[PDB]
Design an enzyme around this catalytic site. Structure first.
Site, PDB file in Angstrom:
ATOM      1  N   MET A   1      38.355  12.457   5.420  1.00 21.87           N
ATOM      2  CA  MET A   1      37.660  13.744   5.417  1.00 21.87           C
ATOM      3  C   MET A   1      37.756  14.492   4.092  1.00 21.87           C
ATOM      4  O   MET A   1      37.821  15.718   4.077  1.00 21.87           O
ATOM      5  CB  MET A   1      38.193  14.639   6.543  1.00 21.87           C
ATOM      6  CG  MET A   1      37.923  14.110   7.935  1.00 21.87           C
ATOM      7  SD  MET A   1      36.159  13.966   8.264  1.00 21.87           S
ATOM      8  CE  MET A   1      35.805  15.692   8.851  1.00 21.87           C
ATOM      9  N   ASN A   2      37.756  13.749   2.989  1.00 27.83           N
ATOM     10  CA  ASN A   2      37.842  14.322   1.646  1.00 27.83           C
ATOM     11  C   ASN A   2      37.007  13.448   0.706  1.00 27.83           C
ATOM     12  O   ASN A   2      37.542  12.798  -0.199  1.00 27.83           O
ATOM     13  CB  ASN A   2      39.290  14.317   1.177  1.00 27.83           C
ATOM     14  CG  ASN A   2      39.455  14.910  -0.199  1.00 27.83           C
ATOM     15  OD1 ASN A   2      40.397  14.567  -0.916  1.00 27.83           O
ATOM     16  ND2 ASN A   2      38.553  15.822  -0.574  1.00 27.83           N
TER      17      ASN A   2
ATOM     18  N   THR B   1      37.531  18.030   2.944  1.00 25.36           N
ATOM     19  CA  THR B   1      36.153  18.578   3.023  1.00 25.36           C
ATOM     20  C   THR B   1      35.967  19.517   1.854  1.00 25.36           C
ATOM     21  O   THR B   1      36.863  20.277   1.498  1.00 25.36           O
ATOM     22  CB  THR B   1      35.904  19.362   4.343  1.00 25.36           C
ATOM     23  OG1 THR B   1      35.985  18.466   5.474  1.00 25.36           O
ATOM     24  CG2 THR B   1      34.514  20.045   4.299  1.00 25.36           C
ATOM     25  N   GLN B   2      34.782  19.468   1.258  1.00 24.20           N
ATOM     26  CA  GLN B   2      34.500  20.276   0.098  1.00 24.20           C
ATOM     27  C   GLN B   2      33.019  20.625  -0.002  1.00 24.20           C
ATOM     28  O   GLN B   2      32.271  20.541   0.975  1.00 24.20           O
ATOM     29  CB  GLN B   2      34.972  19.506  -1.149  1.00 24.20           C
ATOM     30  CG  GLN B   2      34.596  18.013  -1.184  1.00 24.20           C
ATOM     31  CD  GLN B   2      35.122  17.311  -2.448  1.00 24.20           C
ATOM     32  OE1 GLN B   2      36.191  16.687  -2.410  1.00 24.20           O
ATOM     33  NE2 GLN B   2      34.384  17.422  -3.574  1.00 24.20           N
TER      34      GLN B   2
END
Lengths: 233, 233
Positions: A107-108, A1-2
């Site tokens: 999730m990235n 996540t970012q």
């Protein structure tokens, strides 16, 4: 996540009788700061495909590196690399889509919205979208971010459905695209006046235009506007 | 001599030979005969199925890898299952990730590299089976010959197995003829059945003894056994 940091705004495109057109301005924003101006967001792959990217610029540069590698790799032990076995727009898209969906599944994500424009080997026009969620779709016209809200409505007045494609010329199409870029420059606070435009024609090939500028702007009517309600002078 | 250098694949003999690999190659020569040949529109595999007793079935020799690719085996059947399976996955990967059909040439390279790893490391053993790969991709019909040594070659026609030398000479003679059998599957097949029967000796090809496979321009890789091969005997 970012979270995205340096970003590129809209990427717009449409298909006409002999090919596809895609455009994107040359800005790299840093929040509300219009930080970088020499950013090219249209990536040519070979001579039949152009990949337009919006969203995080660091991820865009990564995708750029990935694309140059696909070309190198495809040329390995391939005597037909510049003929029957050259990279097709559809191969390039499927690849990116695959990557985009795997990254969101871990999730990235690669914080982008991508449009792959090109002409297949059999002449067919290719226009498809993919974003950070791995979501994909095709349409006679495609635009990301702000352009989805303001460009598609103008471009769809030219090609509202499939049957309108063959009746549309490069001239009409490019005119529509250029007008859309001007409209975006009027109402999108993260847009730039300078942009690039590319045309992939099944006959003329790939035409990449750099350093275009929004022209023929209407601002004169502004002199008559005063106050915000009752002010007269 | 030999006895001291044939203990494993990781040992070179004084003349630069790899005996374990040569012994694996010998298992191919003990295998039943199979033939392969192609024109510009189709590729064909013809194989002689061997049985144990007159109470047993005739072990299959042709395996489908995708809609456009397949192969025939000669030697250790289990190794053929392992290798064909790896190829099924590679064809699969190509379609899922790039929406591209795997080039027969590329399939040969992947098979070569997979086999090579088993000829340079300790503990492993070379594959003991030969393979004939046919397919129709973006550059036409193709025929490949795979050897456990890792050597893969593209030919117009060929044969492996016991007495394979007969068919091979016949094909090397019929070349100019069958290479032109375009748009006529039944003819290419008959041309192949004639080539295989040039290696017979024991018996004569029967209905539950013959096995044929074809792939081409508008022909997905399909296998013909029994009643379906009657019209060629």
């Amino acid at each position: 996540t970012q979270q995205p940091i340096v970003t590129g705004t809209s990427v717009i495109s449409m298909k006409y009788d002999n090919g596809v057109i895609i455009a994107a301005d040359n800005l790299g924003s840093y929040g509300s700061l219009l930080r970088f101006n020499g950013v090219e967001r249209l990536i040519p792959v070979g001579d039949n495909t152009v990949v337009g990217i919006s969203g995080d610029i660091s991820d865009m540069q990564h995708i750029e590196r990935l694309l140059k590698d696909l070309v190198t790799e495809n040329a390995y032990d391939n005597p037909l690399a510049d003929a029957e076995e050259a990279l097709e727009p559809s191969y390039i898209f499927e690849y990116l889509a695959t990557v985009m969906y795997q990254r969101r599944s871990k999730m990235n994500p690669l914080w982008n919205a991508i449009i792959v424009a090109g002409v297949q080997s059999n002449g067919d026009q290719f226009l498809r979208y993919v974003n950070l969620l791995g979501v994909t779709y095709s349409s006679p016209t495609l635009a990301t971010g702000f352009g989805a809200h303001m460009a598609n409505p103008l471009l769809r007045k030219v090609v509202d459905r499939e049957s309108d494609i063959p009746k549309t010329t490069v001239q009409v199409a490019e005119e529509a695209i250029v007008n859309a870029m001007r409209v975006l420059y009027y109402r999108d606070a993260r847009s730039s006046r300078n942009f690039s435009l590319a045309i992939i024609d099944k006959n003329t090939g790939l035409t990449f235009k750099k350093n275009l500028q929004v022209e023929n702007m209407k601002w004169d009517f502004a002199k008559d506007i005063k106050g915000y309600g009752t002010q007269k002078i | 001599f030999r006895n001291n250098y044939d203990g494993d694949t990781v040992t070179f003999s004084p003349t630069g030979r790899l005996f374990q690999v040569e012994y694996a190659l010998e298992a191919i020569k003990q295998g039943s005969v199979t033939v392969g040949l192609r024109s510009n529109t189709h590729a064909v595999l013809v194989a002689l199925k061997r049985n144990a007793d007159e109470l047993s079935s005739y072990q299959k020799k042709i395996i489908k890898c995708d809609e456009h690719m397949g192969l025939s085996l000669a030697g250790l059947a289990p190794d053929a299952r392992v290798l064909s399976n790896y190829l099924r996955q590679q064809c699969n990967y190509s379609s899922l990730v790039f929406n591209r059909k795997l080039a027969v040439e590329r399939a040969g390279h992947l098979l070569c590299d997979k086999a090579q790893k088993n000829t340079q490391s300790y503990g492993g053993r070379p594959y003991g089976v030969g393979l004939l790969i046919i397919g129709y991709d973006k550059s036409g019909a193709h025929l490949l010959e795979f050897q456990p040594s890792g050597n893969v070659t593209e030919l117009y026609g060929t044969a492996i197995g016991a007495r394979s030398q007969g068919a091979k000479t016949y094909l090397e003679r019929t070349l100019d003829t069958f290479i032109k059998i375009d748009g006529n599957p039944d003819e290419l097949i008959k041309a192949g059945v004639e080539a295989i029967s040039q290696s017979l000796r024991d018996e004569s090809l029967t209905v539950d003894n013959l096995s044929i496979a074809i792939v081409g321009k508008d022909t997905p890789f399909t296998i013909y056994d029994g009643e379906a091969v009657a019209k060629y005997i």
